Amino acid sequence: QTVSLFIWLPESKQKTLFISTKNHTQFELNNIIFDVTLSTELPDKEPNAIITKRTHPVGKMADEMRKYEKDHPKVLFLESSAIHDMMSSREEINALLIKNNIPIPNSFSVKSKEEVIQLLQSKQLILPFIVKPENAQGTFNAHQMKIVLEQEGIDDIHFPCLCQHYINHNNKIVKVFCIGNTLKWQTRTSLPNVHRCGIKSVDFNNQHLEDILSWPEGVIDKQDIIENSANRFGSKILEDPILLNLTSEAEMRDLAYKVRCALGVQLCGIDFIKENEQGNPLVVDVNVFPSYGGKVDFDWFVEKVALCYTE
Ligand SMILES: O=P(O)(O)O[C@@H]1[C@@H](O)[C@H](OP(=O)(O)O)[C@@H](OP(=O)(O)O)[C@@H](O)[C@H]1OP(=O)(O)O
Ligand SMILES: Nc1ncnc2c1ncn2[C@@H]1O[C@H](COP(=O)(O)OP(=O)(O)O)[C@@H](O)[C@H]1O
Ligand SMILES: [Mg+2]
Ligand SMILES: [Mg+2]
């Protein structure tokens, strides 16, 4: 049997994702011949599956994608407009995680300051909390965060947004990347433990972690400033999370399967932290079709996508 897989990615994504690329490749896996094509443009001829990350929620690619899906219903998408749309909403992601009993830090999707005030006053939302935009993917603004340390720190929040209790997790985050059942994982630095010293809020963009160098004195312990300032608080690779005793392979596989089932996604990245590095994994982010650690092997990627397709 033959299966055609078509990888539809802009050059920008191709460059961040792959060490190198091939326009066309053919291989056998589990008694099936796979023909794989890579292009920046949609296929002229209908494949069995299109493998794609939509670059931005709105624009030409989004429009082309929806039209193509409607007009070619037999083509499997990894991943579809509907999946990208859901994963562009922090509300929708977290609602599905909650519905499927996947631990997260306590989270509230809010549309206004009055709502935040009511959650604080009723002791549902506990300080400190991180404020994440409702829009989750494809813009600089999607990654613009505020940590609210005191009630007064709510004044400049951008709505709508997710308010999520801030967990002191000792500045380690576990990243689990999935191509279906195939996983790759790592530990990175994250954010420092924070202190409620009187400062009302601080801000950072997750793409510009050097913002943290400008936080007022007292929010971060002086030793944490010493340990992280040389790297400008950048997201740095650490030792393997199993070797660090942060998690186990079985835990990561279980969690990843649960998340994939909850969200109906095959190509994703899951971020989790642990309070004081102990206890349940707390999922803080799920991303569609991530970078897989960046600069991955093209042949590896396509074989694992084919395996996923068969399953
Ligand atoms: O692969 P990563 O390390 O999880 O980082 C991704 C990645 O940078 C991705 O961009 P792209 O490589 O798919 O173009 C980001 O998506 P957007 O820029 O479209 O929003 C993700 O936000 C990153 O996720 P994170 O930094 O949480 O790891
Ligand atoms: N509830 C939380 N408590 C503490 N730190 C958090 C929490 N949620 C996220 N973070 C930190 O903030 C960073 C950005 O949050 P994340 O949800 O991953 O946003 P993005 O989707 O922009 O990557 C994470 O990498 C982690 O360091
Ligand atoms: Mg993240
Ligand atoms: Mg994200």
Side-chain angles (χ1 to χ4, degrees), residues 96-294:
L96 286 167
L97 297 177
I98 292 173
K99 181 169 178 177
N100 287 278
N101 308 300
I102 295 162
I104 60 171
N106 198 24
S107 300
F108 304 88
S109 287
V110 164
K111 304 171 177 292
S112 75
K113 196 185 285 173
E114 290 307 331
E115 303 173 40
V116 176
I117 292 162
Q118 193 64 43
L119 294 171
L120 288 166
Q121 168 268 286
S122 67
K123 304 190 184 179
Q124 292 185 65
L125 180 59
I126 306 301
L127 290 156
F129 61 92
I130 188 164
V131 178
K132 312 186 189 182
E134 159 59 8
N135 297 336
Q137 190 262 310
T139 59
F140 178 80
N141 283 357
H143 310 288
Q144 185 66 43
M145 312 305 191
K146 182 188 298 299
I147 302 162
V148 175
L149 297 160
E150 302 297 340
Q151 174 196 305
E152 295 81 4
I154 67 178
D155 280 29
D156 304 327
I157 288 171
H158 289 202
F159 299 95
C161 59
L162 186 84
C163 287
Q164 181 175 86
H165 178 62
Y166 192 92
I167 300 292
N168 280 351
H169 56 282
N170 304 342
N171 197 21
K172 295 191 176 79
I173 192 160
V174 181
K175 304 186 74 76
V176 181
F177 305 108
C178 312
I179 305 171
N181 297 128
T182 299
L183 305 194
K184 175 174 165 69
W185 56 75
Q186 61 185 213
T187 318
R188 306 194 79 83
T189 60
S190 184
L191 292 177
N193 298 333
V194 300
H195 291 80
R196 291 174 64 193
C197 69
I199 297 297
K200 310 310 177 195
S201 63
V202 291
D203 299 278
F204 74 100
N205 191 288
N206 200 52
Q207 293 179 352
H208 281 191
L209 289 167
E210 57 263 63
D211 292 347
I212 298 165
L213 295 171
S214 290
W215 288 4
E217 181 177 337
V219 178
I220 306 166
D221 179 79
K222 283 194 170 73
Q223 190 57 43
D224 292 347
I225 294 169
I226 292 172
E227 67 183 7
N228 303 108
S229 285
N231 76 98
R232 300 172 167 170
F233 284 92
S235 179
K236 172 184 149 56
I237 189 78
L238 298 174
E239 287 164 291
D240 171 276
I242 308 168
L243 290 180
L244 286 178
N245 302 131
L246 281 171
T247 191
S248 63
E249 180 165 1
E251 173 163 86
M252 288 183 288
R253 292 195 191 281
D254 172 70
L255 178 60
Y257 178 81
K258 284 167 166 167
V259 170
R260 290 193 312 271
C261 288
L263 291 189
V265 66
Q266 303 295 340
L267 305 185
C268 66
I270 302 160
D271 294 341
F272 74 82
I273 63 179
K274 288 186 175 190
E275 187 159 55
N276 192 30
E277 291 174 72
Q278 297 186 353
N280 291 351
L282 305 169
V283 172
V284 295
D285 194 21
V286 192
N287 302 313
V288 71
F289 199 156
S291 80
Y292 292 89

